[PDB]
Symmetry: none
Subunit: 79 residues, 2 copies
């Protein structure tokens, strides 16, 4: 249900907090947040390196906050 972890990640990579005030489970990275190419690339890097989550926004057109939150909860980690 919760997207707080992902909201904080976005904040962590430099997304402005005013862009994030209405974030919901169905909020989409491109179509709703309007994330830039550099921002999406930074997100893919940090998802992989911090959370073990591997996504490809070159290949896939978009992802919701929910799908990414769930990925984070599900992915195996050594910690």
């Amino acid at each position: 249900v919760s997207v707080d972890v992902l909201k904080q990640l976005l904040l962590d990579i430099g997304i402005a907090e005013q862009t994030l005030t209405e974030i919901e489970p169905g909020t989409r990275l491109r179509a709703d947040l309007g994330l830039s190419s550099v921002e999406t690339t930074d997100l893919e890097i940090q998802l992989r390196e911090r959370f073990g989550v591997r996504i490809n926004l070159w290949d896939k057109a978009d992802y919701t906050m929910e799908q990414l939150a769930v990925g984070i909860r599900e992915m195996p980690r050594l910690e």
Copy 2:
């Protein structure tokens, strides 16, 4: 751009993560990573369509990750 960014762009065109472990400034596109002609072309397309960056990766015989960053 950093080596990290280049590594992600390469992942995103389907270069295997295993092939990218130990990637660094000196790593070469063709002689070390073994990029195919189709993969090279895919990298060009991604740079142009995702970032607005036009680069011709047949202008040189090969590119280290550092030359690629500078060229970008």
